[PDB]
Amino acid sequence: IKTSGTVLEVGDGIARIFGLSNVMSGELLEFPHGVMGMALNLEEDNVGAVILGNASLIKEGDEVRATGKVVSVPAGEDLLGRVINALGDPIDGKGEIHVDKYMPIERKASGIIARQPVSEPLQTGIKSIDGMVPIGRGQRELIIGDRQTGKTAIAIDTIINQKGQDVKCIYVAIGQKRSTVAQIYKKLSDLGCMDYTIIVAATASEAAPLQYMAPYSGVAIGEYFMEKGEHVLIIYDDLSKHAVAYREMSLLLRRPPGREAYPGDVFYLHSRLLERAAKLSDELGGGSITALPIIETQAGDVSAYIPTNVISITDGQIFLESQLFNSGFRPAINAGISVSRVGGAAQIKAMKQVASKVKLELAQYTELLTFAQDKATKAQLERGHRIMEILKQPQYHPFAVERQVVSFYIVINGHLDDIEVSKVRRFEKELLDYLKANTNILTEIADKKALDKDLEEKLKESIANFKKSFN
Amino acid sequence: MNKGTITQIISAVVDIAFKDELPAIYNALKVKLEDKELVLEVEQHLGNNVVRTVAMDSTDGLKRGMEVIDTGKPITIPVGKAVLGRILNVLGEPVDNQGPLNAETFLPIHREAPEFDDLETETEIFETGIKVIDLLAPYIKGGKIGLFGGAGVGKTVLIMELINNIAKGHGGISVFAGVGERTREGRDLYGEMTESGVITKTALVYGQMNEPPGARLRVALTGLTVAENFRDKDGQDVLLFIDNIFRFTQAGSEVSALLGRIPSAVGYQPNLATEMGALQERITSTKSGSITSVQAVYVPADDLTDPAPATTFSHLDATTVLSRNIASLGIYPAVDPLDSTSKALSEDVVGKEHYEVARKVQEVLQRYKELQDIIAILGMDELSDEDKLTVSRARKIERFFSQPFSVAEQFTGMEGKYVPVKETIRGFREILEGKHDDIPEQAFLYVGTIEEAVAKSKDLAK
Amino acid sequence: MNKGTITQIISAVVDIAFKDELPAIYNALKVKLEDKELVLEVEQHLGNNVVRTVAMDSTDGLKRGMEVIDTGKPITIPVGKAVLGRILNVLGEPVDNQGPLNAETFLPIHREAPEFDDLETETEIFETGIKVIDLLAPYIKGGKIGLFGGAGVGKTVLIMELINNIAKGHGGISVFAGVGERTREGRDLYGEMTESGVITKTALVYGQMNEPPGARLRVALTGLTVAENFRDKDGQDVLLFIDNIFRFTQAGSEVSALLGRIPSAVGYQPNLATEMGALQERITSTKSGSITSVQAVYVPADDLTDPAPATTFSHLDATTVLSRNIASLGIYPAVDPLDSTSKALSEDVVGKEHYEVARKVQEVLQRYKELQDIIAILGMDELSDEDKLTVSRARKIERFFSQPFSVAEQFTGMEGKYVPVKETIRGFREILEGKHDDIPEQAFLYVGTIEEAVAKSKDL
């Protein structure tokens, strides 16, 4: 036997195969009934290979052919606006995709010289993020929080505010419910943000190897655009489930357990995936691929094995606490723990000019709030409440970068301190209407991407006269 | 055809060796045990033409080298209208007597879940009658509902109320699936079903505590297989009730050890996620029909971080968490108003007033929970006047969520009061705005409407 | 031609069998791959002329029954003049596309640790420019420095500053070792290095997150072996920066399981102390020359009881523990003054004016921590007049510790400020003497010298 063999043992979605003399590691295997596999454990005599999908069909004796190919995903511009599985086959149920190139699933991340420093913002359109925890193109930013804290809410809200900004989007649903994936598909296509977006789906019903591959397949499709020299925004929802799939594979393949029963290389699993996200140098196009991984904590337990793993890999993180979410602060972001390791490098100059101290002020305000249960502090605490009311914003309503700058200006420079706290949310709404209609200086801010002496004095006056009547 | 011999037995697992042809996975084998025959289910192909099989009944009596025959197909069950108003076994057999079934069609247990695009997107709620649920975590038609609760916090009681509110006075078909819970409840229900007259339209399947692991595992499916048939063949909207789905995932761990799998966290099976997905994704509303599933989830040692309850959360459109702290405080239904959430709670679906009020009470209750640490060691007198009013309102709102249940009428000795969604939002609004600050907090327990709350306050004065 | 052949492959762990003569442990094996060679390092002798190895790159492609060749010695690397200003990998090959490396001499990365006789009692300090450190935990010339912290606490940024302060200003060569951290940060350093002109006087070895286990394991030894050469052969002053020395241990644990090792406490390799001890003892100053090792240490989930940091602590002379509690307040560098230690904080070394204020500071802060329970629940209102002042003074010194960093102008949005040991001591001494009880505590946040802090109060 050469590039073939027979199954001497099968069960639980793995198969020990005899023969396959010159089968390479991570090779795509072909079984009867048109089901696929993947050789991983190349032992002395047998070959431990995991089966993708219909494992129940296989039984002892079945002949197995070796393709002599690494598992690869079909990548093209044709995919945009369509739903895909792990392998690349379309599960949208509306036609078929045709691609120019075939890209591999597993592949090393770029080198040191290959990259260049990130220095161009990926605008989420969320004031509390883009202001004090900004994200740049090529960055990796974790969205970590408990169940039902608004993790996916931030993920999609980001996608929503990439219409016209000319950035491809990839939502990788890992170990999710098909019912939930459908809800996503609709809301995106309803808002008309689907035609520059892809969805990779490896739902709970699908086998572990397909869940395992899902994010690696997702990023490979991203690399296609990156290499060509285009900006991408991949999203992994979520790596905490991705890990459990890899746990399933390993413990069945008889790769021994570690902490929380997870195998040895569950760091390396997410390390090589997230590292793959980067910004390349101008020599290789300058094409980016920003990654937003998601993690699901258990009762706020970040000491857990995977949550801690991912935090140490990424270029910062965003923390969501139900203590805020229930308190009526959406999106429920904790500024204290949330950090961005790129900083103001991935911000427009106008944004840096307003939202620099805002993080520190809020962190200090958080402390002094516990004490209030001096008159200089009584002023600081008043600004504290007001800042937060602005950082609070609804879902499916992402702000443009110009609208954010003015929102931070009014509170920071102290044009919001002589009105009621309840009405500050309404104040900024009416101001953005008044400034868009009358002054037409938002279009200037967007073009200039800075605060001139003119613009600041225009605001100074146009805000002053707006306070002629309070509603 | 395809007859084999038993090589070795190990409690609930049996290894069989076939000479010629080997049966596919999930195939039904049969052995001629003393008097009655036993049904086994093949799982793994070991080698040397041997297969490892999990038994559907007690293996006590099985000798080494006994004869066993392959059916060829998986375990197939009587499916359709014949089953209605009759309690079924794991194998699909009638255990109610009353003659054999009038089975026309048959259908296998193990069948793949509905693929993407066969699914349908529907986001319409329906009032349950229960105040805490209808406001905060409203259930969705054609959705998967989850009832999380520790040992004896009123999760079975809650189901029995929901079937009483929904399935009682509605034309749709129903399905119930007893999985590893009390056999007492089986007789209690079957009696209450017949005497009420709901029995006719609904169908029952049972595999309770007494049943071995293999049984408790597969019963979850057979009932679902029956529920699937009605959304597919007839194309009719059906309701599925399960108690308790945990006992299915539990059974897995008992078997997994014997199948020789390396245990994961807390000695569970390593394929916990997929084994559950291969079931939970099958319970879904398609285009052809629509299934509204309401399944109860046991939380072992009140530990929701436990991987069995932990993973189930990601299969649900609405979830109602039951806390022991609430039950112990003397409030039923013991629904945590902060931990319980539903996907439907959005301005899109429930409107403005519903959403605005729901988020407000959450904000108030959250603040009460925040200050609950300080009050415990010091007292109510210390916290500021601003907080004082929010705490007093919270305690009333918390106690107002309690209401008497029709099922627990014999228990509580009170007429269980169904409250419509529109009258609940009216109440929590009036309490929030502070128009019922004059009423004591002991006039909100087991009331229902706000009109009845003030009536209880006047009843005191007399 | 001491040829062998692969028997079985399991991820990074590859088993190989040799016909006649078997290769010794730790030596490098090469295998022919499509348009490239892969490097494996033998670790164990299984039996029947079979040996278990660990690949230095991904094993996706290896087939059973391929031609493997034995070099008959460990991973020998370039070292000397040539490596300066060049980015090297685990195998010492250049990864900067700046032409090939033509090196003067070639060492193996597996070397013996220097014996008891070879060491020397230096114990003389140098100032950093950072107030918190050089006061409460001063660093030692040719000593062993370590920076403990979790993730997002600010230990990478701290190394970057130490390089900016020390390695840029002072002469002599240096060596940075990127051991299994972010590749982004690699390019970010390389960018700052070339613009600053330090690149010429430094050699960079890398083996980042994206690299497999074997790489992240033995990369530390490559960067170490470069530094070993410079202290002995050349005889020049060396600065060895490593980030992160946890990832060395981590790489060990990944593979450990597949090498047939039973897992020890909290799922580490059972030979955690000796594996680390073998590498750490090798990083030292000697009679023939001295190296100043500044190696950052990750703290899994801020847990100092975790083995990886617990066994590391022993090896370091000066330890700068970073607390997330302090980072949460938003005062970088978030150094814990109670947990930070140095063997150089003694009357002998820094005199008694230094030593006494350093402790008196720690004494005040320890009292504040005790009283922090009371003010939380009962409040400041219910607190003695004697203690009230030792709270406010403690809060001011806590906030004065924070200073703006040159590298962290991108974060803080302020020009970074160096502060010498003299100016630091006087500043804190003046707060203890109760002089600046007039100046609010907000006026100490991210300020260089006390002179500036007193000014800032009225400035705003």
Ligand SMILES: Nc1ncnc2c1ncn2[C@@H]1O[C@H](COP(=O)(O)OP(=O)(O)OP(=O)(O)O)[C@@H](O)[C@H]1O
């Ligand atoms: N900025 C916001 N404003 C208002 N509501 C929000 C906001 N963000 C999230 N929500 C609401 O919070 C709920 C939970 O959001 P989401 O499902 O994104 O969180 P999640 O943690 O990803 O959920 P799951 O844990 O089920 O995956 C949703 O019903 C959504 O409507």
Ligand SMILES: Nc1ncnc2c1ncn2[C@@H]1O[C@H](COP(=O)(O)OP(=O)(O)O)[C@@H](O)[C@H]1O
């Ligand atoms: N809605 C309710 N009203 C009053 N009492 C209840 C209610 N639900 C539960 N109880 C009390 O708690 C017990 C537990 O009910 P049960 O549904 O068996 O809990 P579980 O199914 O979680 O074990 C009941 O016997 C009853 O005494």
Ligand SMILES: Nc1ncnc2c1ncn2[C@@H]1O[C@H](COP(=O)(O)OP(=O)(O)O)[C@@H](O)[C@H]1O
């Ligand atoms: N000197 C400093 N000044 C201000 N902020 C800092 C400083 N050092 C670190 N930080 C903060 O911490 C983050 C960087 O921490 P990092 O060096 O990555 O720590 P670690 O190596 O433990 O992950 C930045 O985003 C920044 O906000």
Ligand SMILES: [Mg+2]
């Ligand atoms: Mg989500």
Ligand SMILES: [Mg+2]
């Ligand atoms: Mg029960």
Ligand SMILES: [Mg+2]
């Ligand atoms: Mg770091």
